Design a protein around this ligand. Structure first.
Ligand SMILES: Cc1sc2ncnc(N(C)C)c2c1C
Ligand SMILES: Cc1sc2ncnc(N(C)C)c2c1C
Ligand SMILES: Cc1sc2ncnc(N(C)C)c2c1C
Ligand SMILES: Cc1sc2ncnc(N(C)C)c2c1C
Length: 282
């Protein structure tokens, strides 16, 4: 079926939970043996969210190459994304090592450091120009260059230096700051505006390594971001945009990381975002 009318048909019939459970039943199951090794317990935020072995990002290290991060490679859309958990106190150096080694231009953050009164990720970037951060375990230096605070999101320019080679690179930090503590946003308008700002920066384009996107577990809000981006790109590329099947795209993405889209409300919100977004593109 088309999307917008499939949408109203699920609303009128109140069957979002049943649709979402079907997706959960059909999703791929691949091994994640490296994630479950005992030496990696303090590298995982949640025991039930792990990268598959076949798609995990490897650190360029011989001691321990493990990080909780996955490469989502979308062949028809010609887009790739790295989805990862919010960094932990003992993985902030690994996180920036990955950004460096994968040649990423942008980092997309969809959570606040504290939500619901608890810490959802480490304070992994510097908050003042004159107070830079040094990650001694991976030999990197990170400096805040500029910050632009808007009503729904903040954009930061960061300098990452590889202290071993003295090479430097500019990284863009795109921080969506207004996702509610509970539920999903009422309108997709600010989320779509944010997606378009990431696109306009070059961070999603083939001349750079894959964008790094995270929330707390790296599957819910993060899944919504890449699902909406890929569906909108396919609607532009195909002769028949009504042929784009958001459930089929989501199942393809779930071949590369488990659990993408965590609730039926996030599934409905993803439909809403693609539907409204397709009208603005034209
Ligand atoms: C006026 C300019 S030039 C420039 N180059 C890189 N990053 C920037 N941000 C997002 C702060 C800027 C701004 C705000
Ligand atoms: C002159 C340039 S280059 C560039 N790259 C990314 N974003 C931009 N804007 C609009 C915030 C710009 C602008 C305004
Ligand atoms: C040279 C660059 S990169 C970039 N990314 C996001 N916003 C920006 N602007 C318009 C403030 C910029 C600028 C000016
Ligand atoms: C939903 C939105 S916001 C926005 N801002 C600038 N350009 C856009 N297009 C057409 C690429 C969009 C779209 C499609």
């Amino acid at each position: 079926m088309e999307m917008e009318k499939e949408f109203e048909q699920i609303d009128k019939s109140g069957s979002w939970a049943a649709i979402y459970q079907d997706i959960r039943h059909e999703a791929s199951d691949f091994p994640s043996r490296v994630a479950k090794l005992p030496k990696n317990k303090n590298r995982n935020r949640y025991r039930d969210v792990s990268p598959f072995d076949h798609s995990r990002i490897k650190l360029h290290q011989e001691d321990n190459d493990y990080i909780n991060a996955s490469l989502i490679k979308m062949e028809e859309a010609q887009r790739s994304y790295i989805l990862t958990q919010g960094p932990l106190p003992n993985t902030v150096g690994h996180f920036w090592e990955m950004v460096w080694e994968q040649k990423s231009r942008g980092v997309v953050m969809l959570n606040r450091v504290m939500e619901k009164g608890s810490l959802k990720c480490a304070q992994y970037w510097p908050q003042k120009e004159e107070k830079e951060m040094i990650f001694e375990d991976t030999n990197l230096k990170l400096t805040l260059i500029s910050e632009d605070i808007k009503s729904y999101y903040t954009v930061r320019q960061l300098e990452l230096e590889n202290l071993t080679t003295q090479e430097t690179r500019e990284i863009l930090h795109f921080h969506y700051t207004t996702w509610p503590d509970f539920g999903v946003p009422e309108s997709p308008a600010s989320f779509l505006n944010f997606l378009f700002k990431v696109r306009e920066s070059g961070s999603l384009s083939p001349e750079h390594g894959p964008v790094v996107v995270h929330c707390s577990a790296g599957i819910g809000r993060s899944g919504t971001f890449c699902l909406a981006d890929t569906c909108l790109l396919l609607m532009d590329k195909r002769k028949d945009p009504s042929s784009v099947d958001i459930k089929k795209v989501l199942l393809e993405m779930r071949k590369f990381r488990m659990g993408l889209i965590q609730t039926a409300d996030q599934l409905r919100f993803s439909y809403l975002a693609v539907i409204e977004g397709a009208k603005f593109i034209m």
